[PDB]
Amino acid sequence: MHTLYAPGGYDIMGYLIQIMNRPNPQVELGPVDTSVALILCDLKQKDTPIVYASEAFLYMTGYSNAEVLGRNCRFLQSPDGMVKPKSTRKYVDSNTINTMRKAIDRNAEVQVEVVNFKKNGQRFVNFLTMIPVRDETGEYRYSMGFQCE
């Protein structure tokens, strides 16, 4: 991976407002702010890399910014943080992974429960919600994910 990051950073607040104001929500999220566990991934870079992670997400997972930025979030699916693309997970429901994959590919909102592992290997069930986000061009460019232990 050789992910690039927006100089100036990301409009996380604007995107949260965009999400809460979206016209046809397929999943209710309730109010959200920058204090919750969240991450932003770039749909237009190789393998949809994490380009922003909230402090609550880092705290929840036990990983640092340096350890999560630039990677696809699937690494949480293994206690050793080693998950190759297209691989058959050995601790995660395959249908669940396919559900996430198809939704992200179609810019469709999705909510699932997925088995994840913290840096120290602690297993937990992550209640995940992913909502596509439009940038200044008005087209879907990012995906904002919300995590819940």
Ligand X SMILES: Cc1cc2nc3c(=O)[nH]c(=O)nc-3n(C[C@H](O)[C@H](O)[C@H](O)COP(=O)(O)OP(=O)(O)OC[C@H]3O[C@@H](n4cnc5c(N)ncnc54)[C@H](O)[C@@H]3O)c2cc1C
**What are 1's two structure tokens?**
């991976």
For a copy of itself (CB under 8 A), the number of binding residues is 22
CB contact set of 39 (below 8 Å; sequence gap of 6+): 50, 52, 53, 54, 57, 68, 73, 144, 145, 147
Measure the CA–CA gap between 87 and 94, rounded to whole angstroms: 10
> Using CB under 8 A, which of 2, 84, 86, 90 touches a copy of itself?
2
The CA-CA-CA angle for residues 115, 120, 122, to 5°, reads: 35
Instruction: Choose the contact partner of 77 out of ligand X, a copy of itself, none; CB within 5 to 8 A by kind.
Output: ligand X
Residue 142 Cβ, how far from a copy of itself at the closest point, in Å? Answer: 13
Q: Toward a copy of itself, which CB reaches closer, 5 or 124?
A: 5
List contacts with a copy of itself (CB under 8 A): 1-4, 6, 8-14, 16-18, 20-21, 31-34, 52
Task: Tell me the binding residues for FAD.
Answer: 72-74, 77, 86-87, 89, 98, 101, 116, 126, 147
